[PDB]
Amino acid sequence: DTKEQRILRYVQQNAKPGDPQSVLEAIDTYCTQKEWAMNVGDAKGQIMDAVIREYSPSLVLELGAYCGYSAVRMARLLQPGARLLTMEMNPDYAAITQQMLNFAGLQDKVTILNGASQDLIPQLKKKYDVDTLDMVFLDHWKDRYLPDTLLLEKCGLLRKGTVLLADNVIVPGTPDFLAYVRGSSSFECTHYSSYLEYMKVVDGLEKAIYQGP
Numbered sequence: 001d002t003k004e005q006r007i008l009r010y011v012q013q014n015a016k017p018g019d020p021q022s023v024l025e026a027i028d029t030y031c032t033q034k035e036w037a038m039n040v041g042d043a044k045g046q047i048m049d050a051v052i053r054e055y056s057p058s059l060v061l062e063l064g065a066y067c068g069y070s071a072v073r074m075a076r077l078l079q080p081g082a083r084l085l086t087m088e089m090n091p092d093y094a095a096i097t098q099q100m101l102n103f104a105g106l107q108d109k110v111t112i113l114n115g116a117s118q119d120l121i122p123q124l125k126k127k128y129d130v131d132t133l134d135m136v137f138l139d140h141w142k143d144r145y146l147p148d149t150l151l152l153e154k155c156g157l158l159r160k161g162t163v164l165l166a167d168n169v170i171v172p173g174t175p176d177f178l179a180y181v182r183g184s185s186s187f188e189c190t191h192y193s194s195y196l197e198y199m200k201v202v203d204g205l206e207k208a209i210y211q212g213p
């Protein structure tokens, strides 16, 4: 099997069905003790929790689902009737993510879209009945953060106050995205210093709030 199958199996055997907190704890234990994996992790996850709680977004778009750790993290804090859309182009990972959300009991709040964000974002309004997004979590391949931010803008999916929250702006780093949003009057930016998941390596999240065109 794969590392991602092993993470899912560990959750199934070390967490409680319908208990998202125990799912997060099981993933973080497995990835600390056994196999590193690119989940946002508990240190940066706590910052995300604080952001989600501050904004109480009704519609969140996640770019990059992997095994479902950040989808579980965010969906467990969504208010009743709020929703998360998560885009994941790797079908093996999308299948793991669905099973992770099912185990956590959060599947009614999350819709997985299997495809590439650059192909799916232009379809959100017509095919997925989106007006504008309240919050976007960018955590896919780092060279896509800037192109997809610009694409979300072009597609009319950002409104004044939409929160963009970007993982890994230090490691691996997203230099063009970071320079662009920090230099742009269309975004108000804040940096949240933290640590790379499961490692004593400095990383950080960037929050970029859209200000309109």
Ligand SMILES: C[S@@+](CC[C@H](N)C(=O)[O-])C[C@H]1O[C@@H](n2cnc3c(N)ncnc32)[C@H](O)[C@@H]1O
Binding pocket: 038, 039, 040, 041, 063, 064, 065, 066, 067, 068, 069, 070, 071, 087, 088, 089, 090, 093, 115, 116, 117, 118, 139, 140, 141, 144
């Ligand atoms: C860092 S992992 C996501 C981790 C997840 N957000 C978490 O914290 O649990 C990055 C993911 O982005 C996916 N990916 C990369 N480029 C993508 C794209 N253009 N569209 C959709 N998914 C993409 C990869 O297949 C991978 O699963």
Ligand SMILES: CC(=O)C(=Cc1cc(O)c(O)c([N+](=O)[O-])c1)C(C)=O
Binding pocket: 038, 039, 040, 139, 140, 141, 142, 167, 168, 171, 172, 197
């Ligand atoms: C390239 C890679 O795998 C590494 C970290 C990483 C961490 C993330 O949090 C993340 O989202 C992504 N990503 O490529 O999407 C990657 C390292 C340290 O090698």
Ligand SMILES: [Mg+2]
Binding pocket: 038, 039, 040, 139, 167, 168
């Ligand atoms: Mg990441």
